[PDB]
């Protein structure tokens, strides 16, 4: 599934991401745009046996287990293919584990380099919510 920005925003707000640890909703939609380009089936192989999965590109060495990455910690305690769903619940619940405090969105390199410091609210203005 490739989401539209408003539809992803509404689904993210329903799963408790609006102002989660002080982060406004637009941050989360801007991160998904630059990480997966809003695709739930997005995958990225890295220069190490890790692969990043789904809408928020969650890493197979640390957060989900794919049974293929050397060293899997699996801290979200989830199989990586569960994150490739058109429903984003699993992906949001793991993201909430990753963001333990008000500086946790630095876990996504694209958010830090491309969203942080810009008008991320522009991604949700005019969406019904």
């Amino acid at each position: 599934k490739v989401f539209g920005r408003c539809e992803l925003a509404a689904a993210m707000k329903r799963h408790g991401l609006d102002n989660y640890r002080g982060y406004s909703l637009g941050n989360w939609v801007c991160a998904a745009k630059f990480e997966s380009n809003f695709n739930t089936q997005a995958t990225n192989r890295n220069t190490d046996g890790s692969t990043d999965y789904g809408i928020l590109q969650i890493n197979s060495r640390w957060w989900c287990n794919d049974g293929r990455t050397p060293g899997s910690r699996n801290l979200c305690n989830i199989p990586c293919s569960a994150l490739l769903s058109s429903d984003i619940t699993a992906s949001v619940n793991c993201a909430k584990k990753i963001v333990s405090d008000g500086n946790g969105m630095n876990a996504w390199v694209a958010w830090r380099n491309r969203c942080k410091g810009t008008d991320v609210q522009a991604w949700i203005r005019g969406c019904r919510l």
Partner: antibody
Amino acid sequence: QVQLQESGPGLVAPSQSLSITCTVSGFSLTGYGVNWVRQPPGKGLEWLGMIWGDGNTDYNSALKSRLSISKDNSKSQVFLKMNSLHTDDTARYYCARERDYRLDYWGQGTTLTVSS
Amino acid sequence: DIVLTQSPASLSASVGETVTITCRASGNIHNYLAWYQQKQGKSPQLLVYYTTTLADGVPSRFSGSGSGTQYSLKINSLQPEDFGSYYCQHFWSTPRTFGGGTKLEIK
């Protein structure tokens, strides 16, 4: 330690253009916006404008034609330039860091009096 | 431009009273509203952002509420250091504007 400190001329005649500097420390200007706010003697706060981490600027509707904000990321400085000065521009001017739609750290302000 | 109407202009109160300050927006600001305290001769200090969230270090006797267009700051059992001015500010697109201010003074 996040610090913002304003420096300005103190007194100006209508024939001059105002330039005020905000020197920041403890954070990068690429990751945060800086807003400029003023407060006339014994009055409330007035928003003047801002410059985002990416360099885009947005201004108060009424004052946009007289204002210009810019920054030098390596010097860690933000500048407010104002021209066509009127005595109602007499105020304390403040720069404040914006972090995700709240102004969490504020400078002490500089007082400016506009003369004849 | 969305304008904010803040009231009252002044409140006289004793220590230990609860008081409420309101800001009404001329258009929906979608919860992007912040409150600041300004002590005599000091910089404004952030108290509350996104309508309800306390800034780090603000005591829990401050609470914010509101939705759409009317918003409130309530101060329960106010203390000697709470006297000063209070301002609301919205962050829905640009230009941003401030409420006119409320002076909280000793009774």
